[PDB]
Amino acid sequence: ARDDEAAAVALSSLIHALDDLDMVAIVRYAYDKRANPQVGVAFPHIKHNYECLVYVQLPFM
């Protein structure tokens, strides 16, 4: 989120570490009170003007 440039630098370091290590982050997402929390995969997306992580939902057994 904007106005937290320290969080921006932290996110950038996260992205760089993911690139170097070829890691992908397993995460738990809960949209709101009445949306079911669920599991997805987060991987970085990098463009010259922005680096970002991309969340994709994942299934259960």
Binding site: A1, R2, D4, A7, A10, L11, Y31, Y55
Partner: protein
């Protein structure tokens, strides 16, 4: 619409974030209205639900 929240890491780190459903499915933003064939209005067009008695009857439940 973005998702301004705070990603929690372990037990001591939190990062304000802004998610975006950048890729999305395609669906019409204008629904279809079934108006009357004569008045061309839906005001006379409304549903009547009947939970007809599941026994040897037809009274709405």
């Amino acid at each position: 619409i973005h998702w301004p929240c705070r990603l929690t890491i372990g037990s001591n780190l939190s990062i304000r974030i802004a998610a975006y459903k950048s890729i999305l499915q395609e669906r019409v933003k204008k629904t279809w209205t079934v108006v009357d064939a004569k008045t061309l209005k839906k005001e006379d067009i409304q549903k009547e639900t009947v939970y007809c008695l599941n026994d040897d009857d037809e009274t709405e439940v």
